[PDB]
Design a protein around this ligand. Structure first.
Ligand SMILES: *SCCS(=O)(=O)O
Length: 107
């Protein structure tokens, strides 16, 4: 029963960032064909349940080529972290340890 919101456009992305209010937002920039993305996706979804006070968004880079370019995603999965629409952290790679440590550092 995932809390992850699928983002399908640049407009949906901006509005999700604003809807977060003051809460940490974590965004997974992913693709359907990407092996490491597929490996970490269920863990990103489980974390969305573990951390009910953090907002979890998924952006498919083939769906949201505009979001991917603007957010300067070079490889997938990339995880970017926001507060009030503002980027407060980022890293690249399907790294479960780093993903959870970054949530805990930033929340
Ligand atoms: S991550 C960059 C998103 S936006 O500033 O282009 O809205």
């Amino acid at each position: 029963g995932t809390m992850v919101k699928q983002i399908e456009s640049k407009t949906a992305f901006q509005k999700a960032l604003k809807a977060a209010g003051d809460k940490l937002v974590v965004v997974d920039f992913s693709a359907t064909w990407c092996g490491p993305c597929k490996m970490i996706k269920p863990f990103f979804h489980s974390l969305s349940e573990k951390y009910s006070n953090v907002i979890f968004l998924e952006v498919d880079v083939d769906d949201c080529q505009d979001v991917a370019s603007e957010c300067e995603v070079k490889c997938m999965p990339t995880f970017q972290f926001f507060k009030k629409g503002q980027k407060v952290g980022e890293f690249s790679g399907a790294n479960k340890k780093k993903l959870e440590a970054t949530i805990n550092k930033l929340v």
